[PDB]
Structures are given as structure tokens and as C-alpha cells.
């Protein structure tokens, strides 16, 4: 048994993918369009889906936004240098919280940066 | 880089832990009370935190429940037998919102479980 992925709904897939590939070093593992359901799925990550947990991004073409609650916490990512990754995301124009840093993606989801070791 | 974990706030940590450890066969990797912040956290998974992504569960002492939005999707888990996991969660009293269905090639064997807080757990059968 193993954890395969966590899924999040996004209002703009291309903005979501820019954050996960520019502010973070994720690779597009697979993307799939379903016109019959008017949505697109994209899997982003590091290793192959067969080898590690990925992030699933759902984009329902008809939704302008999603009401995030206070139940969902965050997605934690292991980084080499927390301050650097945080500075790079700040420089790209992304929101940052003001060894451990917090970013938020274009939809408002929180990403926890944890420096390898700790 | 690598994904370490996903975090969810639970109204009752004991109820949440019983579902993940009993219905889903996860092990308790970490648990700590923080009286200074009035919260407790727990880490559940299948492998060591150094090797794989885990699930972090938080319970804030001053809360009796959480407003779950429509943004968060689900946590997906790989299972040997989705029919068996469904029957097992149901035998313990948990809700299966979508049964696995007849196991056959090349049908996608996917099931949906609901945890005690109403979070969605997607069960994908190994081999699909
Ligand atoms: Ni859109
Ligand atoms: Ni965390
Ligand atoms: Ni999924």
C-alpha cells in the first residue's frame, strides 16, 4: 500500500502549472483533457507516479473559483534551501508568508517548505 | 525536492486516527501535543517519512469542526484489492460513497471512501 497523490481544484490550469514548475521544480508527469466532462487533469511531481506521490490538479473549465475552507491545511515540500526557494518565489511575484517557509499558489493553497534534514 | 506530506485539520484526532490506521492499514509515524499552541498533530503513512509522502492530521483544541470548501479534492491511495478495502471500511462503520465495482480488465477499479470529517479518500487498485 502507498499514497499516490493529493488532488486540488484550480481556477486556471496554466497559472497553476507555472507555479509548480517555476516557484517549485515539479515536472508535468501527465495532462489529460476530457471535453465530455469539461475538465482537464494534470499530474505534477518529481519521480514517476509508479515511484512517488504526485500532485493532481483539476481544472473544471466552467468554474471561476473555489471556496477553500479552513479544513485543508497545506502540502509540504522538502527543499535544499528554504530562504532561497522562498526568495525565488517572492521574486517571481508569488505570495509568501511573513529552515521553514510558506508559499501560496495562484488559487490560495498553502505550500510548506521544509529544509532537507529537519 | 520531494513531496513530504499533505495536511488536514480533523474535529476529533482519535476518530480520524482510528479510520486511517484501522480502515486503511496506515501506521502512526509521529504524534505530539503542543499545549503552548493548544493543538496536537499526528503523522500517518505506509513508509518512513524519509522514504515516502505521509498524511499530517491536526486537531486545534479550541475547535469542534472545520468548514470544508469545494477546492480540496482527495487523497489517493494504492490498494491490493479495492473491493476488500471497501467491505472492510463498511464493516467498521465508514461510508463508501462509490463502490469499487466488478474487478476486470480494462475497467478502472476506483473507489471513494469518506473519512470521519468528510474528507474524500480515492482508492485506486494496483494494476488499474
Ligand atoms: Ni478555468
Ligand atoms: Ni506540515
Ligand atoms: Ni485522484
Name the one residue in this structure whose C-alpha cell is 476488500: B84
Q: What distance lies between CA B26 and its chain's CA centroid?
A: 9
C-alpha cell at B41: 498533530
Binding residues of A for succinate, as ranges, are: 38
A46 neighbourhood in chain B, CB within 8 Å: 1-3
Count helices and strands in chain B by DSSP H and E runs: 2, 8
Of A7, A45, A73, the CB nearest to B8: A73
B122 bridge partner residues: B76, B112
List, in order of start, the domains of chain B with CATH numbers.
1-128 (3.10.180.10)
Of A25, A69, A73, the CB nearest to B56: A73
C-alpha cell at A4: 499516490
C-alpha cell at B18: 482510528
- Among B109, B115, B97, B126, residue whose Cα is nearest residue B44: B115
State the Cα–Cα distance between residues A46 and A91, nearest whole angstrom. 23
B39 neighbourhood in chain A, CB within 8 Å: none
- Cβ partners under 8 Å of residue B109, min gap 6: B82, B100, B101, B103, B124, B125, B128
A-contacting residues of B 52-111, CB under 8 Å?
Answer: 52-56, 58, 66-80
Q: Hey, which residues of A are catalytic here?
A: 112
B53 and A53 in contact (C-beta within 8 Å)?
yes
Maximum Cα interatomic distance, chain A, rounded to a whole number of Å: 46
- Cβ partners under 8 Å of residue A62, min gap 6: A38
Backbone φ and ψ of B54, nearest 5°? -120, 180
State the Cα–Cα distance between residues B31 and B13, nearest whole angstrom. 10
A68:B69 CB<8 A: yes
User: Is the CB of residue A35 less than 8 Å away from at least one CB of chain B?
Assistant: no
A19 and A105 in contact (C-beta within 8 Å)?
yes
User: Is the CB of residue B4 less than 8 Å away from at least one CB of chain A?
Assistant: yes
C-alpha cell at B81: 484489492
- Helical H segments across chain A, by residue range: 13-18, 82-92
Q: How far is CA A68 from CA A30, A46, A73, B69, B104, in A?
A: 25, 26, 10, 4, 37
A112 bridge partner residues: A76, A102
Determination approach: X-ray
- Cβ partners under 8 Å of residue A86, min gap 6: A96, A101, A103, A113
B7 and B60 in contact (C-beta within 8 Å)?
no
Amino acid at each position: 500500500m502507498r499514497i499516490l497523490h493529493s488532488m486540488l481544484r484550480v481556477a486556471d490550469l496554466e497559472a497553476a502549472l507555472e507555479f509548480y514548475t517555476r516557484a517549485l521544480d515539479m515536472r508535468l508527469l501527465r495532462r489529460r483533457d476530457y471535453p465530455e466532462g469539461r475538465f482537464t487533469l494534470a499530474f505534477v511531481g518529481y519521480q514517476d507516479e509508479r515511484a512517488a506521490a504526485a500532485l493532481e490538479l483539476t481544472h473544471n473549465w466552467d468554474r471561476d473559483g473555489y471556496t477553500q475552507g479552513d479544513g485543508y491545511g497545506h502540502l509540504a515540500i522538502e527543499v535544499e534551501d528554504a530562504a532561497v526557494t522562498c526568495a525565488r518565489a517572492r521574486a517571481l511575484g508569488y505570495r509568501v508568508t511573513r529552515v521553514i517557509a510558506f508559499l501560496e499558489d495562484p488559487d490560495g493553497y498553502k505550500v510548506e517548505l521544509i529544509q532537507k534534514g529537519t
